[PDB]
Write a protein that binds this ligand. Structure first.
Ligand code: HEM
Length: 288
């Protein structure tokens, strides 16, 4: 991990040591981040990887430009949200509307390009049929955070080639007339969460099978994300070009190199929470 000048490595050194008190006085002792433990009760012999805890707080300094007092304030807002909301539970415990699970695909390519080995896919174009999934906003957002968290169970935060995620939206089928404020409302809601609570986890996001009559949509949505993640956005009118960016995505649809199996056959279904993730979840269900 690289510091531009000592003073940045000094806010890392300070933050790393402030974490116990921070977590304890203001987060209420919850220290599950992205399925890993970051709070050194000496079971911690067992479930505390230091280099993972350290890369994740690096990740949070980078996100907030090594401005100390901003880092801690958002580290609080993240950890509290992880308690009040339950992101781990959205992925591994809750039941989600069935037509929704079918449009969330999760794939991993052990030999893929850096930070394009873990990908999640939303087949949102399939859901212009069904604009009732969007009236109950909260249950959607719980579905999607569930896919977000399952994606990160596939990352290796210690690595340099697999500590970020890639995401594809397939909008094949959207009609430019059916763009009602229900959809606007789910988008903006999820977006706020990704922005406020999942920073420094996206590498690239591809939006494929999008006609050019949709420019006004793309312009309006983008005003809800920061320049940092906006620079990672790519819009593809022709979905078969996707293999030019994801080397091992399915040949069918996505022009990729895997001609054996399509996207459905590429899915991952064994999802299996992280070690600490499981602890947090089962210990939660004795104090009901
Ligand atoms: C009409 C059907 C659509 C639905 C249901 C939909 C749904 C969503 C949702 C739920 C999100 C936020 C998080 C995501 O799920 O990962 C999102 C984000 C976004 N959408 Fe769409 N969308 C639609 C159409 C479009 C179109 C036509 C465009 C034009 C390019 C577009 C561009 C974007 C962009 C740039 C974001 C921000 C993603 C990010 O910040 O991570 N969407 N959309």
């Amino acid at each position: 991990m690289k510091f531009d000048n000592d003073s940045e490595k000094q806010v890392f050194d300070k933050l790393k040591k402030a974490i116990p008190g921070i977590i304890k006085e203001k987060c209420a002792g919850y220290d599950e981040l992205y399925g890993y433990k970051l709070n050194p009760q000496e079971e911690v012999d067992k479930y505390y990887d230091e280099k993972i805890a350290d890369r994740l707080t690096y990740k949070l300094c980078k996100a907030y430009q090594f401005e100390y007092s901003t880092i801690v304030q958002n580290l609080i807002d993240i950890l509290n949200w992880r308690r009040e909301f339950n992101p781990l539970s959205c992925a591994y415990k809750e039941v989600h509307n069935t037509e929704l699970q079918n449009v969330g695909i999760l794939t991993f390519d052990a030999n893929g390009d850096a930070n394009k080995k873990a990908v999640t896919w939303n087949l949102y174009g399939q859901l212009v049929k069904k604009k009732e999934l969007f009236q109950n906003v909260d249950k959607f957002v719980r579905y999607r955070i569930g896919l977000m968290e399952k994606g990160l169970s596939l990352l290796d935060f210690t690595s340099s080639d697999n500590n970020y995620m890639t995401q594809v939206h397939d909008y094949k089928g959207v009609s430019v007339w059916r763009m009602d404020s229900d959809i606007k409302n789910c988008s903006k809601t999820v977006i706020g969460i990704f922005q406020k609570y999942y920073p420094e986890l996206l590498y690239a996001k591809y939006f494929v099978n999008v006609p050019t009559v949709f420019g006004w949509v793309y312009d309006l949505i983008k005003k809800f994300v920061d320049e940092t993640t906006r620079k990672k956005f790519v819009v593809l009118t022709d979905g078969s070009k996707l293999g030019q960016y994801l080397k091992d995505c399915p040949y069918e649809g996505y022009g990729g190199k895997d001609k054996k199996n399509n996207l459905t056959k590429q899915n991952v279904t064994n999802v299996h929470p992280t070690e600490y993730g499981l602890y947090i979840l089962q210990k939660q269900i004795i104090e009901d």
